[PDB]
Design a protein around this nucleic acid. Structure first.
Ligand SMILES: [Mn+2]
Ligand SMILES: [Mn+2]
Ligand SMILES: [Mn+2]
Ligand SMILES: [Mn+2]
Lengths: 247, 241
DNA sequence: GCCGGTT
DNA sequence: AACCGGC
DNA sequence: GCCGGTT
DNA sequence: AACCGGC
């Protein structure tokens, strides 16, 4: 990670930080503001990075050619926008924040990519693990890493900002940081109903995986396929059986 | 619908207004059907305020006088229990309905969907196909076939400089649509997805029929998704394990 | 504690 | 509660 | 037109 | 992008 060396800083700055009454999505901006101040040459919003990539290559027009600028099938897959959106891009028609985008922030350096999400949590409310990332997208990601042998190109990490309502604004009370690729893949909770999302709180994320990036991919694909099989038959029991009587 | 007879009115007041764009409608409905119109959370408060005698969740759950409505409108046991005149419910993202209209102990559940017609059409989550399944099951077990409708109002808008402007609307009734026509997007939180404007309204049977017909559709689509899971999520990745 | 459905 | 983009 | 994954 | 409640 690029932000880990200064995490203790981020942690200490964000704590006690307040914002005017995700619900706490103004806390993301602080993290981005901070990143952009201490690692400014590394820090991008995902759309910002796409904009920079294309601005550096004005000659390169069309989606075909523009996709080539990625030098990576897995990154092309995680990062790019659609073909018409890419074809249509211009200095006048730049990319903007996109609901669906994979990552909140990109830390890039020497061709190594850290995709960073900021999750925000209302510590008052009962714990409810948030959607992290699509288990399916993650399966595809794992398959593309293996097919193209990209096991040393990018990490997917998380920064959780705990907050509470203090009078008339939100205040951050603590944070956590975890690395997707350091967890035991077979331990990832896939919530099929919840748009097929891996779900957890960062603070709970296991961080003891031992093998290589390749082994993680293989093991996650095993876990995915197993959970998918289980869910298939588990659907008959929960969504069919209970209703058969009425028909 | 209580809304339908005055749809022209609504349409006419909304078209051209300026400001996802959370668009009133509530305002209009309130100022024209005051004693019929409620946010969901507000209707809950109303119900409990009107019965200070009752306390505890079990007792206040009886105030609904309907297993189905209880299923659709009520908060959890604890939050009900802890409800107080000095501790009211607030808007909850999770609530079934945007607006509830009730007259003569009949309920119209109204969602207001918004839509940027500048962008390319993408059917929105409407309601959980699994929630709807439980709903029809409850309607049948409890013979509540004349109690509530679930209806939708689509506000089409478009960005003009600084201000976002409504430029058309649609209204449909869920229980007038061909149940087997309803698109159940499993991956999308098991949601029914449609735009209102596109919603079949040619159903002619009874409420009971609709419910039984829907459950048949649901059970069928659940099996199909179960099976489809193998091809979509299993075979494509086996070559790696 | 464990678990998964909904906006 | 929306939201894009493959073919 | 058709269809369905993601934040 | 997060959000409750059943036992
Ligand atoms: Mn993101
Ligand atoms: Mn975020
Ligand atoms: Mn609603
Ligand atoms: Mn709405």
């Amino acid at each position: 990670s690029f932000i880990k060396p200064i995490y203790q800083d981020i942690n200490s700055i964000l704590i006690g930080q307040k914002v005017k009454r995700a619900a706490g999505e103004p806390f993301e901006k602080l993290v981005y503001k901070f990143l952009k101040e201490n690692l400014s040459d590394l820090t991008f919003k995902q759309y910002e990075y796409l904009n920079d990539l294309f601005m550096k290559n004005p000659a390169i027009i069309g989606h075909e050619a523009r996709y080539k600028l990625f030098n990576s099938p897995t990154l092309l897959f995680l990062l790019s926008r659609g073909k018409a959106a890419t074809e249509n891009w211009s200095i006048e028609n730049l990319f903007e924040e996109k609901q669906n985008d994979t990552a909140d922030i990109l830390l890039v350096k020497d061709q190594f990519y850290e995709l960073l999400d900021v999750k925000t949590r209302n510590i008052s409310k009962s714990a409810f693990a948030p959607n992290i990332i699509s288990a399916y997208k993650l399966a595809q990601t794992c398959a593309k890493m293996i097919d193209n042998k990209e096991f040393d190109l990018f990490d997917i990490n998380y920064l959780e900002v705990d907050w509470e309502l203090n009078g008339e604004d939100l205040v951050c009370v603590s944070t956590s940081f975890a690395e997707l690729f350091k967890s035991e893949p077979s331990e990832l909770y896939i919530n099929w109903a919840a748009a097929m999302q891996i779900q957890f709180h960062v603070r709970d994320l296991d961080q003891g995986f031992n093998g290589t990036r390749e082994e993680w991919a293989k093991s996650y694909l095993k876990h995915f396929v197993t959970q998918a099989e289980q869910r298939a038959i588990s659907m008959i029991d929960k969504f069919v059986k209970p209703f058969k009587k009425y028909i």
